[PDB]
Design an enzyme around this catalytic site. Structure first.
Site, PDB file in Angstrom:
ATOM      1  CD  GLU A 138      -1.186  -0.375   3.739  1.00  0.00           C
ATOM      2  OE1 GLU A 138      -2.161   0.569   3.831  1.00  0.00           O
ATOM      3  OE2 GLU A 138      -0.870  -0.733   4.975  1.00  0.00           O
ATOM      4  CD  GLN A 206      -4.268  -3.423   3.579  1.00  0.00           C
ATOM      5  OE1 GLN A 206      -4.435  -2.154   3.671  1.00  0.00           O
ATOM      6  NE2 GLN A 206      -3.341  -4.098   3.757  1.00  0.00           N
ATOM      7  CE1 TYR A 208      -9.717  -3.607   5.609  1.00  0.00           C
ATOM      8  CE2 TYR A 208      -8.427  -1.748   6.657  1.00  0.00           C
ATOM      9  CZ  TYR A 208      -8.489  -2.969   6.358  1.00  0.00           C
ATOM     10  OH  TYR A 208      -7.453  -3.869   6.774  1.00  0.00           O
ATOM     11  CD  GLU A 252      -7.196   1.392  13.617  1.00  0.00           C
ATOM     12  OE1 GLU A 252      -7.577   2.172  12.699  1.00  0.00           O
ATOM     13  OE2 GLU A 252      -6.258   1.194  13.842  1.00  0.00           O
ATOM     14  CD  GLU A 253      -7.353   1.738  20.667  1.00  0.00           C
ATOM     15  OE1 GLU A 253      -8.061   1.103  20.087  1.00  0.00           O
ATOM     16  OE2 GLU A 253      -6.199   1.343  20.857  1.00  0.00           O
ATOM     17  CG  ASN A 259      -8.085   4.907  10.942  1.00  0.00           C
ATOM     18  OD1 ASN A 259      -7.151   4.499  10.063  1.00  0.00           O
ATOM     19  ND2 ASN A 259      -8.571   4.282  11.913  1.00  0.00           N
ATOM     20  CG  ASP A 687       0.268  18.139 -34.793  1.00  0.00           C
ATOM     21  OD1 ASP A 687      -0.191  18.576 -35.951  1.00  0.00           O
ATOM     22  OD2 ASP A 687      -0.731  18.334 -33.842  1.00  0.00           O
ATOM     23  N   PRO A 802      -3.769  26.105 -37.534  1.00  0.00           N
ATOM     24  CG  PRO A 802      -5.601  25.371 -38.464  1.00  0.00           C
ATOM     25  CD  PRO A 802      -4.931  26.678 -38.365  1.00  0.00           C
TER      26      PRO A 802
END
Ligand SMILES: CC(=O)N[C@@H]1[C@@H](O)[C@H](O[C@@H]2O[C@H](CO[C@H]3O[C@H](CO)[C@@H](O)[C@H](O)[C@@H]3O[C@@H]3O[C@H](CO)[C@@H](O[C@@H]4O[C@H](CO)[C@H](O)[C@H](O)[C@H]4O)[C@H](O)[C@H]3NC(C)=O)[C@@H](O)[C@H](O[C@H]3O[C@H](CO)[C@@H](O)[C@H](O)[C@@H]3O[C@@H]3O[C@H](CO)[C@@H](O[C@@H]4O[C@H](CO[C@]5(C(=O)O)C[C@H](O)[C@@H](NC(C)=O)[C@H]([C@H](O)[C@H](O)CO)O5)[C@H](O)[C@H](O)[C@H]4O)[C@H](O)[C@H]3NC(C)=O)[C@@H]2O)[C@@H](CO)O[C@H]1O
Ligand SMILES: [Ca+2]
Length: 876
Positions: A138, A206, A208, A252-253, A259, A687, A802
């Site tokens: 990652e 992953q 999430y 997660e605390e 997150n 071109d 052009p």
């Protein structure tokens, strides 16, 4: 530290539940940090893979001694592999790379990469006798050197990743240890999947949050991107479905915005135990989710498994801090998700209820998968070459099979819809997703059409009946009718078969009337093949490549005479409504086969949205269908499909009158030498993209450009354009084209500064109001040119150009040819040198050279050879 030896364990069997355990939440991590009360060794047996997730934990800590001596034996006894997880950087070196930090001991050499891999396994797998390695791919673990991402380190991790694979994993020397790749990238954005897939046991994604489930949103096109199924389809190229595991995350605390995932139940003060329920959450959705094609998945995994049961705080509600407190986990959500996947019908084992024939069941299991969910989803080839198969009962349970091969099945005597895959006929997907979709899109999707399975019959000696009616089989290919000897009754009606001429189907068809004439039983009941609706396809190639036409005041339809026709998948070509009427009433054994209802309008393809481009010898391009033969000219006709406006489907040559050589654009790719115009947009003049894909202009009132041709040659024509009727009354109104002959004021070193001053020749002086201007030129061989444009406007006029073409014939060293011809034509001018008669040998050889230069059929050899003729006499 005495590390006990690995104990025996059962083999891994899906579906699998994995879980990342955070080392700093083990009790033994930090004895002082007394708020951590969970233990890794208390994970339930529902956990199949226990990932060790190390950071914020001491190196000299007692957790490592605890893990190697207590947790690993405890989890192995219940059948739980303990996996060490390392970041991507550890395989590359540089910033924060663990073992790879010691570059002197493990350099970036082929021998060093081999030795680093062994050191990684010794350090992260064998040291505490863990069950496998897990490399984490990652952005949060990309290799870096001095905090910037290292494209050099990424390449090294690929080499090290293979070297690790030669030690552990499915292809490693030690197959007792797993080798896993968890990642956030789509397979195309994953640098290591391409070479690492053969070496890995499993692959974790992953995914999430609601972006992990619904995918990202393309706000431009109002569509989802990087969806779950899209992500799987990317990785399905490299790995099997039973290796693919998806993942959610617990709360997660004290997690910050960016997150928060909300993969579990949101907190509720009226239920202090809602977090341990799993119903309707993204975690259970992932458990119940299965890919629509290929086969069932490997399982699901959870990050932060130490926080199982803790409810997620409300998105915009008032803050709740009791959710951040660390409590001991009962892992109820982890167990519930394991049972949900086990009790899922998609993982039910295939038994005799599906395939009563045991010879048939074993072949399916060993080729499709042991689970019933693979029947609904297997997307490949099934080969039944075991002659012992007595009953094909159950092949209609195959829903998305791609190829069916029945080889040498002597004991099979009948083939109809009940013993064939249900996608023998056109079918649609019946599987329903369980994931949420975007409420910011339209209504939910419609059923995706399932491609039809390819049927191959060969060696079925005992087959008596072959019923395939109403299946829209596209052709009869793969049927070895010469080996189907015992056939008595056959039906092939309501299909798309071009049973005609000497077509492949028509040869199988006729080999099959034989085996039911040798078998004298034939009625109008026993061999039915009518109501055929063969699909009409665009011809691969078209017939008319050249057309020589006389000069006369009459238009012709180019598309009508060059591009037409419909072609079946067997070879039949139908051009007009009459050709199909002669094709429609074509009989086989005194009976038509093409359906009456299926008329010409429904069979022939149409050329309504097709486009034509006609280019003449002066590179003049027109798009009209008609073509007036009132002028002697050689053209170049191309036809383009609506699906592709760049690659032509058929190309042709139209010659009106005598054939002229096609001239090319000598200025295409020209090098800008100097001038007044912006060099970025001066290149866009030469071109090639026909008048500029919405690009821009030169200067602010009046621009000049000095340019050099790539390959110099004979110049006969020139052309420039204005903008694509995008502008009006802002056109270039005065132009001056110049050619350079002042030899060179030396300074080959500095071309430009003396290019800017020396003596030029005006070859064209345009003044008009057109959108396109073209004009012939009198055989100039210069290599340096100057264009000046002016639009007769304010000093802030913003002139544009052009594209500009310098058109002629590619003649190498044409400058020396023109100067020599000039030196000879102006030297025979002076008849006072010698007798007029002896130098008539030069006067006739100069008009041979000039006529070769002005001939419609420009011949390079006739000019280069005849150039040397006048070159000798000027040398005198
Ligand atoms: C599959 C998967 O999920 N994949 C990923 C996954 O990684 C994500 O999970 C996250 O992972 C985090 C770990 O990532 C690291 O490891 C990965 C794998 O190993 C790797 O891929 C990562 O890139 C990363 O690698 C590390 O990178 C760092 C940075 O470069 C390296 O650090 C350097 O190390 C060298 C030594 O080698 C030097 O020391 C350098 O100085 C140092 O910078 C490190 O080496 C790399 N590691 C390796 C192995 O190479 C993980 O941490 C995340 O979890 C955190 O956050 C969640 C909430 O989001 C929380 O619940 C977790 O508990 C955890 O919180 C941390 O807990 C620590 C333990 O207590 C704590 O550390 C202690 O803090 C003390 C308190 O200190 C103060 C202070 O002193 O200032 C006190 C203040 O009051 C307070 N202020 C406040 C609260 O307002 C501040 C705060 O800390 C403030 O917020 C500042 O930011 O701090 C004290 O300081 C102690 O001394 C200290 O030890 C931390 O402070 C907290 N941190 C936080 C933010 O709370 C997370 O799980 C996952 C997520 O979705 O998915 C994928 O992305
Ligand atoms: Ca252009």
């Amino acid at each position: 530290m005495k590390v006990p030896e690995k104990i025996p364990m059962k083999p891994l069997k899906g579906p699998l539940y994995g879980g990342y355990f955070r080392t700093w939440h083990d009790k033994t991590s930090d004895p002082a940090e007394k708020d951590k009360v969970n233990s890794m060794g208390e994970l339930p047996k529902e956990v199949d893979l226990a990932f060790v997730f190390h950071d914020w934990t001491k190196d000299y800590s007692l957790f490592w001694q605890e893990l190697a001596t207590k947790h690993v034996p405890t989890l192995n006894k219940q059948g739980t592999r303990v996996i060490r997880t390392i970041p991507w950087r550890f395989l590359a070196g540089g910033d924060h790379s663990g073992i790879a930090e010691d570059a002197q001991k493990y350099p970036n050499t082929p021998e060093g990469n081999k030795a680093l891999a062994k050191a990684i396994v010794d350090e992260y797998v064998y040291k505490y006798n863990l069950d496998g390695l897990d490399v984490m791919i990652e952005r949060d673990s990309i290799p870096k050197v001095n905090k910037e991402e290292s494209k050099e380190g990424i390449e090294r991790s690929i080499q090290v990743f293979e070297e690790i694979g030669k030690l552990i994993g499915p292809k490693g020397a030690d197959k007792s240890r797993l080798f896993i790749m968890d990642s956030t990238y789509m397979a195309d954005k994953n640098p290591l999947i391409e070479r690492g897939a053969p070496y890995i046991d499993l692959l974790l994604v992953q995914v999430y949050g609601t972006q992990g489930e619904k995918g990202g949103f393309d706000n431009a096109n109002h569509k989802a991107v990087d969806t779950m199924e899209e992500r799987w389809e990317s990785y399905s190229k490299y790995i099997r479905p039973e290796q693919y595991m998806v993942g959610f995350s617990f709360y997660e605390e004290k997690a910050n915005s960016g997150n928060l995932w909300y993969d579990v139940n949101v907190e509720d003060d009226t239920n202090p135990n809602i977090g341990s329920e799993i119903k309707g959450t993204r975690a259970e959705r992932y458990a119940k989710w299965q890919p629509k094609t290929g086969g069932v998945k490997g399982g699901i995994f959870s990050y932060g498994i130490d926080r199982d049961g803790v409810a997620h705080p409300k998105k915009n509600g008032p803050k709740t801090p009791d959710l951040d407190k660390i409590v001991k986990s009962d892992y109820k959500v982890s167990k519930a998700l394991k049972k949900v996947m086990e009790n899922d019908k998609s993982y039910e084992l295939i038994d005799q209820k599906d395939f009563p024939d045991k010879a048939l069941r074993e072949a399916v299991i060993a080729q499709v998968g042991s689970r019933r969910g693979n029947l609904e989803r297997f997307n490949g080839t099934l080969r039944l070459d075991n002659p012992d198969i007595k009953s094909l009962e159950g092949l209609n349970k195959l829903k998305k099979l791609a190829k069916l091969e029945l080889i040498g099945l002597s004991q099979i005597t009948k083939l109809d819809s009940s013993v064939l895959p249900e996608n023998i006929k056109p079918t649609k997907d019946t599987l329903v997703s369980v994931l949420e979709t975007y409420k910011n899109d339209d209504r939910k999707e419609e059923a995706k059409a399932i491609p039809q399975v390819a049927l191959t019959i060969s060696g079925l000696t005992g087959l008596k009946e072959l019923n395939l009616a109403g299946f829209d089989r596209d052709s009869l290919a793969g049927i070895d009718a010469a080996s189907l000897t015992s056939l008595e009754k056959v039906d092939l009606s309501s299909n798309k078969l071009d049973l005609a001429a000497g077509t492949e189907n028509r040869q199988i068809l006729d080999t099959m009337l034989a085996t039911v004439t040798k078998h004298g039983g034939v009625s109008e009941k026993t061999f039915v093949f009518d109501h055929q609706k063969p699909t009409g396809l665009y011809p691969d190639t078209y017939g008319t490549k050249s057309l020589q036409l006389p000069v006369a005041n009459d238009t012709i339809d180019l598309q009508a005479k060059l591009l037409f026709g419909t072609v079946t998948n067997q070879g039949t070509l139908i051009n007009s409504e009459a050709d199909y009427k002669a094709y429609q009433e074509q009989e086989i054994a005194g009976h038509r086969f093409v359906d009456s209802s299926y008329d010409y309008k429904a069979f022939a393809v149409t050329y309504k949205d097709y486009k034509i481009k006609v280019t003449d010898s002066t590179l003049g391009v027109t798009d009209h269908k008609d073509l007036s033969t009132s002028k002697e000219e050689t053209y170049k006709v191309e036809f383009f499909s609506p699906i592709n406006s760049t690659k032509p489907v058929h190309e042709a040559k139209i010659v009106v009158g005598e054939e002229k050589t096609m001239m090319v654009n000598l200025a295409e790719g020209a090098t800008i030498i100097g001038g007044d115009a912006d060099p970025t947009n001066a290149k866009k003049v030469f071109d090639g993209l026909l008048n500029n894909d919405t690009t821009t202009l030169s200067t602010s009132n009046k621009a000049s450009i000095i340019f050099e041709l790539k390959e110099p040659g004979l110049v006969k024509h020139w052309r420039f354009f204005n903008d694509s009727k995008i502008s009006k009354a802002d056109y270039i109104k005065e132009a001056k084209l110049e050619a350079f002959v002042g030899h060179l004021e030396d300074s080959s070193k500095v071309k430009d500064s003396l290019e800017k001053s020396t003596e030029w020749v005006t070859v064209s002086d345009y003044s008009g109001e057109a959108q396109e201007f073209s004009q012939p030129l009198n055989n100039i061989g210069a290599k340096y040119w100057r264009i000046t444009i002016d639009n007769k406007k304010s000093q802030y006029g913003y002139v544009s150009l052009p594209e500009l073409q310098i058109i002629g014939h590619r003649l190498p060293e044409a400058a020396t040819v023109m100067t020599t011809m000039a030196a000879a034509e102006e030297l025979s001018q002076q008849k006072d040198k010698f007798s007029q008669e002896q130098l008539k040998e030069l006067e006739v050889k100069v008009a041979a050279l000039k006529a070769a230069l002005d001939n419609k059929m420009f011949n390079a050899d006739t000019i280069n050879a005849s150039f040397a003729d006048v070159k000798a006499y000027i040398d005198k």
